[model samples]
Target chain A: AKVLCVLYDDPVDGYPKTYARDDLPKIDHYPGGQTLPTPKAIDFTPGQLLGSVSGELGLRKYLESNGHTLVVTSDKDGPDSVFERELVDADVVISQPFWPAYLTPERIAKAKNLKLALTAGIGSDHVDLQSAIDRNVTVAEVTYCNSISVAEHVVMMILSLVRNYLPSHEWARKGGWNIADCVSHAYDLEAMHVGTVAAGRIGLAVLRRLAPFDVHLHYTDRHRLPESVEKELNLTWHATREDMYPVCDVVTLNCPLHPETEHMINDETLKLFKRGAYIVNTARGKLCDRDAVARALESGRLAGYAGDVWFPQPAPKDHPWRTMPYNGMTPHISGTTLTAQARYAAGTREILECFFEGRPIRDEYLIVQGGALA
Target chain B: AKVLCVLYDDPVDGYPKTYARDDLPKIDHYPGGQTLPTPKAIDFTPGQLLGSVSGELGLRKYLESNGHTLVVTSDKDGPDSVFERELVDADVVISQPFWPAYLTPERIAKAKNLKLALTAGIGSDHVDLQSAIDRNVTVAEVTYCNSISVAEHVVMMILSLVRNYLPSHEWARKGGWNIADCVSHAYDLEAMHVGTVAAGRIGLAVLRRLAPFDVHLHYTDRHRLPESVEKELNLTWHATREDMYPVCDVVTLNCPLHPETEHMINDETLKLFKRGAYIVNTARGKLCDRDAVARALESGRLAGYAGDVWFPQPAPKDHPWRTMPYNGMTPHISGTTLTAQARYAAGTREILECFFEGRPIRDEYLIVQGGALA
Candidate 1:
């Protein structure tokens, strides 16, 4: 069967092209580029993470090897969107958050035969999750697959923002080593508050990981955790997002983007933050107003901003936040770290194995059911 | 009082002129030149940390507003070391690890009236702690001043080394972005058996901070920790340094440099580490063989090398490690962060206050015991 895969415009050495955005990023964003390098040709090592495993980080390889046609492109917006045209006859549509095809209800309506949509890694938010629910579409992400990966990214972005790493690095690279000039903008994580807005798996994981520092750890989630988890972890719970702002030195948005979370981090909410709070969004770019982040960075209301996720996967070169100062933001490569690749690849295949055998997908993996009644 | 103060050269904003070295650092190290920045020149406003009364952050104005002299220079070595030459008439010496003034016994014999040695931030190993102890020198650092600052540095270098941030940034600056190239050298911090040596104040502090990531934490110190501390923190103890290496993905040295610890992480120690384990040493440069670290970084025995300390502070322009690959080495400036600067300045004043009043210095600040005590 022909499967429609929407990746990014950028080429993937191992990942499908549909997982990247085709655009040049600011040269300064990639410190990785100058060091260990991209291969001249695709040198698939024993266990290298493809540019991404979005369409299964290469589970598509397993499928294509078995004689399936996979139409993959990193592009999936405006005119070139394969989902807009090719989804009509595709039996399976595969995408990943690293470079989502963004299946809105409108887009899903075009794929008359689209019975399944797979997010090889985690996060199926771009699919308009409820639309999939209503349309009787089988939607599953590699659940819990990349939580550790994203949790690490959260910790990374927090330190990057709080410490002002991106700009300091740029200053160093661009021949500006007035140490004080750079350090004046940097800070210590000790005694500085770092909180996560959603205390689900990734958020709780972040809080757990940041707990050893003896610094205050705060979490705000819709459901209150058992009293034991809070007391043992030294976690301070915020009942409301509004209450989290002024006290948090670093605020990470780990909540999924949905009707409730879309632009939840807008200007009004941002002003409630203690001036110079650092912001990290590994959850979704649009969950926070991208412009609000840039403005806060400029005005010093937010000390800095960082995350790999962008409003659209594979951020455009002209993304305003790209050139903003004091950011440690980068491409959406966090969940696909080579080590993380190992976990998600196996997880993807496990899901495939269950599907091919006509078995029920793991309840944990399901974000959308194919029918009204389970 | 005509107080003589010897300062390491910092061209951050207010001062320029490298008095110690034969030539200035490459332009990249100090682009600001002779202009020292004042409080008014700051671009960002940090809401003063609430409930803090140290006034450390505001010390610059108080010092400058009052009629106190501040001499800043990078010269602190050879026959004409700013410290050795100027100490004869000096009451206090303000030095930094970034550009330390070595205060050896021979130099101490010359500074007849010198009363105290103030580490502008932390790590007073630059001044012989024992020599100061013998000379009634009150040597003190900002206790627990910049652990988070250095911890961030350690993590930054770890990721930079493993992920190849330096080279990647270089490639991007030169206009290139390839995912394969970036991930080739990149690895994840999660689940890695990263360890910290000398689980004392700084070492334990690093472990405590890293505890939340679920990475295995290991510590090796002469004094074993309480079992409860280990179990509570999920830490593994190594009775000997020999036991810590084989399993580590990264090993950071946070111990002080004493006779036993000098060259504590040289070729022999490097061999024990897993083939690609990274190493970070912000303790003292002499703790490891500098050339060996360069060689290890070259041979991939150690995947990366990082530290702010160099054996002889103020590394020569042509130091091999200065140009070594797989490194996040900086100019021994981690602890002298702007925030740390404020803390140490206050600590320095308290030291000075004790000296001027002819009171016994605080026990913690005493590094020397004059006369027969030596």
Candidate 2:
């Protein structure tokens, strides 16, 4: 079987001769007691950059040892790109949310031997799920591989926005001591009402992390969290995002991107938010109307906005978000931290082993399997 | 009696005609049950900027109504500044740590009628404590006024550095989608050992906030935290900074500055830390040896350095920290957010009321009184 993987480009300076830290700290289990990714073995160091083309996600050795072909590339854009050209007869497709290989319906249809579509990281939206189900393709992801990583990014963005940190940092970098100018728009996050569009793994982690900061936590999700869980975190539940937006000083989008959720934060819903509300969306970018967010910041309806996700991976040079005032945008790199890359890369190998050996994949990792959304 | 106050300048565009948000969220009390600053009454809105010269720290009306003269100015730099000219007969001297009015022993000796030195915010190291004690002058500050504010800044900087956010933000702002370039230095804060120089109010709050992120917490302080507190937060205690430095992946300084603690993080101490360790110091810039920090970052011995405090209030344009690689420095701003300005301003009024009425100031607010450190 041939496995096709799409990873981001290697560092411009080339593969690092050394990393910032000597090693990654070991973790026994996740907060929810889920054990770390358990592949039979890993061939790469835990702190290495495994999400790049040359890095190969530590999968080349494992697959080749078992007599399977592995193809990896950073050439993943447009139809003429290598990824589109190589999809034809690949039995397995592996992609990451950070550098998504958009498996559109047209591409999925052309991949004649595609049996499994695996996300090395979370968020399977880049894959056309309905098309996969129609073709009886299995779609799975490393479910909890980087949930904490994205949660940390959300908290960082929230603090950065409210405290006006980026502009303040600019002052320091530019050799100015403009304390008054830096703080005129600055504020503390304490006692602010902060809500999330969903309260699943990433969102719940964000709420838990923010609780100690003394912010009022609110969330709206289709499946309500357990009463005990809500009570423990002192969370308020809203039936819909609309209700949560008006009361929140900060609204973070954490729900999956789908027909119902995509563009949920368009002009109308954005109008429902408080006058100076902040928004952070690390889950997916299309979850918001890109132009609307830019306009909101321009009109001062939003005080600040920030996240590490965008509507398109490798956002075009002129993407409005890149130049929007008060934006703390970053390239889509949240879920691919070196620490997270290690876990996701190992999990990808685990899923491959299960597929090749005729063993069952973990139930939690399944998103669309056996021709339906699992 | 005359009251003299030195504050930062107003907004560059002049005092804001409209603020980012309509109002600040209300906080009831400090974390340790210290009640919010309670003056007999407040003369200004709580959400307004009271730390600027024009804003007057909300002290004008209150002092004038009781027949005391109030003088406020942003000019406090040198011997020729207005602060020096007005100090001769002032009975009360008020200053803020953000824009400190340094009261050296020479100035203290010149001010024959100076009886009270009050800090509108926390940290009174700006004043010469020895001179205050020798002159039988009382020194007090609004304790815990912005501990949470500075703690939030610490956590923000930690996540920003480990995740490589500041530079990533630059990529977005500069219209590039270089995922690999942005993430080459990024890592997760989870499962990392993070320690603080002191586990006082700010440090404890920072540790509590970081608890949910699953990082290992360590601290070194003059006074050990209660046994239950250590267990509750799962904290490890070190008797000295030397013992804690080598083991921490990140270190934060939260202790106050004094003769004994000055330049604690000099060249000798820098060598004790892990090669790529990060450092955040919001306490006092003098706590660190300035050039040694810049050298560490240049040598790659330190991955990143960030803080809002500088040895001098307005660091010179040539300060090495401004242009150092991988820095997230800001002007002295962690404690002067609009939300914090409200509390500290009110706290200043509370201390003034007690002084004029001959009532004892809150015991917690007193740093030095009756010729000795409280």
Candidate 3:
């Protein structure tokens, strides 16, 4: 049986990537382009400089040494995707939220030997959960592995839009000093109304992070948070997106992407927002109507749109959002911080170790257990 | 008594820039470079277009109409500068942090009739405070006008450096989809030790804004913050920056620049910082030795440096930080948010109105009063 890891490729450093180490390097304290070779063949390539998904490649040494075949590739799109080709005989498929290898019903059905799906980072919606449930193929993830990471990105994007930070920083970086050019559209987050589409872990964390900025925080979700938590954070609960949009100066999507949420931020719904309101999505790309977002920004209806998530992972270079004015898009790398990588990689190893030993996995890590959703 | 406002020029939208309307016009919320004449002419000149600094050339209509003299220009650097020529006998000099007219002691000595130095926004550092104290010059600024605005910017820059947001954002903006390139340098803020040189208004606000990120906070200030506040925010008080920097992964400069603090972050202090620690300066630029910062960054002793200030107004295009690696510097526009502009402008007008009506100016607004430092 084989464990196949589908992840985005490291364009700069290519192959021979390795990450097996006693400790993850301190990336925050290191320069990006400065590098030196390892003394021996490395494990888990340094993704920061090399652009490699360290966790996926890091598993090569451990799994292969344990007598199991391992496969990792970023080619995960289209009918002929290498990911699809390799999944057929994979006993377990490993994927990451940043570069999800979408497991559709047909693909899940085709993967006859796929008894388990492991998410290297949080978010398992990329896999057809219902199909996995029906097929009795267990699905698990590194729970809380990168929640704070994503939460921090959400806050950064929010402040980026509100402060008009991207243009301002661009102005400075490019040797332009016209303060008017930068400060013209700039605004303070203080006293502005901000809302999150869903008040789950990431959304709540974002709202909590934003509390001290003196902004009015609003949120909507199927399950309302505890009364004390809402009061402490001075949160306003909205029943639906419609109720939330008009009052929000900025709207962040934190809801999971599903059929119900797909394209929820389309033209009609955008009209409900405060004109020129900013939008941030870190949850999933499909949750937003990409065209609508671009058009909204084009028409001056949305002041700014920022997110790292894209509909198709590794959004094509020509993705309209890439060139969309008033946008602060990033490659879907928000949750793959060095700290996060160390965490999820350890979680990935823990899960694999438990499985190889024929022992029960941590209950909290299970997404689908005993043929049913956990 | 002439009111001479030294502000940046607005080449677009020639005069009568108005913020009279209750709502802020959508500023290119649509897209960049795709302009159709707004029902009114508008551009990146929002700072000028909105005319809060109506104290500037926009004041032509308001002041001339009401029987007063107004002079405005951007050339304020040399002896022959338009601003210097106008300030010789000007009774009131209005300036902004965005387009400051650095009033040296010599310049003040030349301006025999200069009785009032009014800063339209916060930070009266550009004017020689000691000279103001000696020359019977009443120096006042809009107190608390944009402190929060700048406080938010400090948080943005700190996160921008810690998360390696600039390069990540650059990779995305430049039509790249390399996640490893971005994530490799990025790190979560949680567990990082962060400190402020002086926990004053902006510093305290920064710590408050950062409180929820679950980082260990430290600060050293001339005046210690309240015990209750420190304990609540989980902050450690260091008697000195030398003691603080060694522990802080990120150090923010929030203290006002003065003789005691001038060039405080020179080579010696840089060495005191933990290797590769990040520094953020939203305070006066001279607080740091410009050359030392560039050197530290080049040597990778500092992971990154982010600030929205410079030693001189209109920093030379060849400013090293403009092209420095891992830098996130901006023009001194952090406190000039459109919201802050409105408040500061209103405050500027209120001070002028009181001065004209023979009423006492607010004590809080006075930086130097009655020929002495307030």
Query: What TM-score would every model get versus the actual structure?
Result: 0.81, 0.97, 0.88
lDDT score at residue A186, model 1, on the 0-100 scale: 59
Writing each residue's lDDT as its tens digit, candidate 1 over A170-237 gives 54334344455445565656566778898887888788767764458788999877899889888888
DockQ of 1: 0.18
lDDT of 3 at B158: 90
Report the C-alpha displacement of residue A316, candidate 3, in angstroms.
1.3
DockQ of each: 0.18, 0.85, 0.39
What tier of docking accuracy does candidate 2 attain? high
Report the CAPRI category for model 3.
acceptable
Winner by DockQ between candidate 2 and candidate 1: 2
Candidate order (TM-score): 2, 3, 1
Residue B1's lDDT within candidate 2 is 83
DockQ of 3: 0.39
Candidate 2 lDDT, B198-228, residue by residue in tens: 9999999999998988899999999899999
- How far in Å is the alpha carbon of A138 misplaced in model 2? 2.3
**For residue B45, what is the lDDT in candidate 1?**
26
Model 3 residue-pair collision total:
9
Worst 10 residues of 1 chain B by lDDT: B23-32
Tens-digit per-residue lDDT, B1-374, candidate 3:
68778876552344444421125433221111322111211123333343334335234555566587888777777889888898888988988877778889999999878888988887686798898888888898877777778899999889888888888888887888877767656778876889998877688889999988877899999878889989899899999878899888889999877788899999988998777688999898888999899999887788889998887657888888788888889887888777667566666766776665567777777888753233
Chain B TM, per prediction: 0.79, 0.96, 0.85
Best candidate according to DockQ: 2
Cα error, candidate 3, residue B200 (Å): 0.7
A1-374 in candidate 3: lDDT tens per residue?
59988876664665433321112334331112212221123454333232254346467787888799988887888789888899889998988877788889999999989888888888687888899988888888877767778889989888988788888887787778766667666788887789998887688888989998878899999879999999999999999988999988889999987788899999999999887799999888888898999999887788899999887767887788888988988888877887777667767777777776566767767988733233
